[PDB]
Amino acid sequence: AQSVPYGVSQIKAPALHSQGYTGSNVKVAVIDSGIDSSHPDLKVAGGASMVPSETNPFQDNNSHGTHVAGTVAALNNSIGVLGVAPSASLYAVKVLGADGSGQYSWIINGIEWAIANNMDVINMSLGGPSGSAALKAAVDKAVASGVVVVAAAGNEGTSGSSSTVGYPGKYPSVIAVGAVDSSNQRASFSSVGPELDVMAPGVSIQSTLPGNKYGAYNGTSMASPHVAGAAALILSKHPNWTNTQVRSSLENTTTKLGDSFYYGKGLINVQAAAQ
Ligand SMILES: [Ca+2]
Ligand SMILES: [Ca+2]
């Protein structure tokens, strides 16, 4: 029947579920490669596509977006997996093509969309090594608007003492998420630097795949959603908190693990974070 992936347990999401907080009424935008609307373990509330050659956002041609969405909110039923915030309202915002890539403008368009539609949380399990002025402006706009923005830190490992976090995670207004294994040890591909903020499970993350399938992937793209999902549970318990409050609470309630250059503030603990 249904399994609870370990990563979900590892951030203490189940504890909130038993208090009765499952992400209800919270709008999460997954800014990725779309969400397969034919997967029974997902409930999509809305969406829009910014890729010109692939106008249906409910059609994930890459499978990256569907896996990410499953971590956030795979439904609580008799099958497949379970997500961090299983009652969250999930929006498919397509900005990456079949090949996994996307144009900055598509990405910006997708942020603008999320803003305009009053998304509560945005997940960006994507990144590049270069930022742009307009990317930064849109991300700043989201946070200025009241949205919690989460982004993968990247899968660039270490490079001596240089920062390896990619854009948009490198920006201050964004929560950059690195990955740990089940042992709380950083995964070797996990990006590092001053901008890394928090850690979440990123190794063998079992989630939803297109075509009514399930599978495991590793990477900071798999870690990010854990945090976006955590932000969702907090907002279900404290609808009146601002993103300011949510971000603060997640960063001040972590489990510390090692030099912040490598672990940022540590592993999130949404049970603690949620108050
Ligand atoms: Ca399920
Ligand atoms: Ca950051």
CA 189 – CA 182 distance, rounded (Å): 15
Q: How far is the CA of 256 from the centre of ligand 2 (A)?
A: 17
Catalytically annotated residue among 63, 221, 236, 249: 221
Q: How far is the CA of 200 from the centre of ligand 2 (A)?
A: 15
Is the backbone of residue 88 left (phi > 0), alpha (psi -120 to 50) or beta?
A: beta
CA 112 – CA 31 distance, rounded (Å): 11
108 annotated to bind ligand: no
Ligand nearest to C-alpha 74: 1
Q: Does the annotation count 53 as an active-site position?
A: no
CA 220 – CA 54 distance, rounded (Å): 25
Ligand nearest to C-alpha 154: 2
Q: How far is the CA of 40 from the centre of ligand 1 (A)?
A: 8
Ordered DSSP codes for 77-138: SSSS---SSTT-EEEEEE-S-TTS---HHHHHHHHHHHHHTT-SEEEE---BS---HHHHHH
- Tokens at residue 137, please? 């402006």
- The sheet with strand 44-49 has its strands ordered as 44-49, 89-94, 27-32, 121-124, 148-152, 175-180, 198-201
2 annotated to bind ligand: yes
CA 107 – CA 227 distance, rounded (Å): 20
174 annotated to bind ligand: yes
| Helices (H), ranges, 133-208 | 133-145
CA 272 – CA 225 distance, rounded (Å): 18
Structural domains of the chain, ranges and CATH numbers in brackets: 1-275 (3.40.50.200)
Which of 207, 234, 200 is closest to 23 using CA atoms?
A: 234
169 annotated to bind ligand: yes
Strand, coil or helix: what is 272? helix
Q: Does the annotation count 221 as an active-site position?
A: yes
Q: Does the annotation count 89 as an active-site position?
A: no
76 annotated to bind ligand: no
Cβ neighbours, 10 Å, residue 160: 5
Q: How far is the CA of 81 from the centre of ligand 1 (A)?
A: 4
81 annotated to bind ligand: yes
| Helices (H), ranges, 205-254 | 220-237, 243-251
Strand, coil or helix: what is 209? strand
**Contact indicator for 222, 177 with CB cutoff of 8 Å:** no
Q: How far is the CA of 151 from the centre of ligand 1 (A)?
A: 24
Ligand nearest to C-alpha 251: 2
Residue type, 36: D
166 annotated to bind ligand: no
Helices 64-73, 220-237: axis angle to 10 degrees equals: 30
Ligand nearest to C-alpha 151: 2
Q: How far is the CA of 196 from the centre of ligand 2 (A)?
A: 6
Q: How far is the CA of 149 from the centre of ligand 2 (A)?
A: 10
Catalytically annotated residue among 17, 39, 64, 67: 64
